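User: Last request for today: this protein with zinc ion, please.
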Amino acid sequence: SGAIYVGNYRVVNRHLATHNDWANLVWEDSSRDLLVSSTTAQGCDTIARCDCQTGVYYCSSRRKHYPVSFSKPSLIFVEASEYYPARYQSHLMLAVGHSEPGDCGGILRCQHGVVGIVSTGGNGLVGFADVRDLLWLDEE
Ligand SMILES: C[C@H](CS(N)(=O)=O)c1ccccc1
Ligand SMILES: C[C@H](CS(N)(=O)=O)c1ccccc1
Ligand SMILES: [Zn+2]
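Assistant: Here's the final one, the structure of the complex with zinc ion:
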């Protein structure tokens, strides 16, 4: 689990979104595993605006942060899970590291801020849903 809180937005894994997230839906993309909902409280998170390929992610299944190199956001074939059939997930970044389903929502951070959230895993890889292209997360 986990979310990004920026302005009046909450960013979550689309497959972990709650009834309240869907009741307050701003934007969702099934191809990206992202959903953004509106919040009443102001979020303080800073979104990175950059092309970093190094950062640190939180891994709840190890209670640890790990430094990783990760690929630029791309269209990656992702195996079926129970939340999706096998499909191309877009805007996905891969790194070598540990990820279990409950790790979804762990933040990946660079020097500039929040890069994305854990979305996929298995075969010793971790996939992060990029958010850096969502420039609208920083206004109204
Ligand atoms: C929020 C919606 C249904 S509702 N109550 O009409 O908002 C929802 C249904 C199933 C899984 C996740 C979310
Ligand atoms: C079992 C699934 C497979 S997938 N292809 O990543 O959806 C999963 C593993 C680890 C983290 C998140 C999800
Ligand atoms: Zn950066």
